[model samples]
Target: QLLTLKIKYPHQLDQKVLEKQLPGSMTIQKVKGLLSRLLKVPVSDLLLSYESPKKPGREIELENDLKSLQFYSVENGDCLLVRW
Candidate 1:
């Protein structure tokens, strides 16, 4: 399944939002590396998460690099924010 994500950086208020289409089977580490290449930043320096509307003020941290996107219950149209 294709997971659509909107990436942002809280510290980078001027940075443009990035949109991406990722496979649900893709690992978090792989996704971070891809984002690193695209954003021109070190993958290890970035933190990622998505806040579901169903759960306010709760951020889903993407820290398990070995786990697949699906393993995290990530779905299509889910938006993820990236930060250093």
Candidate 2:
């Protein structure tokens, strides 16, 4: 099954610094690597938390949440929260 993920940028960190310090561009794989390193977990074991669906559709599993969600060119004061 496919999943939808929201990318959330850190409020405390500067967008320019994050872009420079983080390796690679804002792709799924790159974000996965960044999160994995920050959380100190294997890339395969990460799970993103999301909200429930409001309409009738396929159910989204929490276990198979997402592999990555990127926030490379995030604007200041921008944050995202997504569900899949």
Candidate 3:
């Protein structure tokens, strides 16, 4: 089983803002690091969700034949509601 980490935002933010808030720039590796730090989990335990126009979906624990991955460059309407 794969996990989907959905990144929801209140208002649509620019890629630069996202890059600033996130642990690293808009990159697969950086997304992975951000998720790990935010969720307090190990990097190897997570996988980027692969779908049409790959974007952060939801963070799920790996199980069977499923895996999660990271992506960069969000779409036009990309937004996230981050909380601490």
| Number of the top-ranking candidate, with TM-score as the measure | 1
- Of 1 and 3, the candidate ahead on lDDT is 1
TM-score, per-candidate, Cα-based = 0.83, 0.32, 0.36
Per-residue CA lDDT of model 1 for 22-59, tens digit only, reads 99999999989998998899988988887655676578
Q: What is the lDDT of candidate 3?
A: 0.41
How many clashes (backbone atoms < 3 Å, residues ≥3 apart in a chain or on different chains) does model 1 have? 0
- Candidate 3: residue 53 lDDT (0-100): 30
Clashes of each: 0, 0, 19
TM-score of 3: 0.36
lDDT-based ranking, best first?
1, 3, 2
Give the per-residue Cα lDDT of candidate 3 at 76: 34
Report lDDT (CA) for all predictions.
0.81, 0.37, 0.41
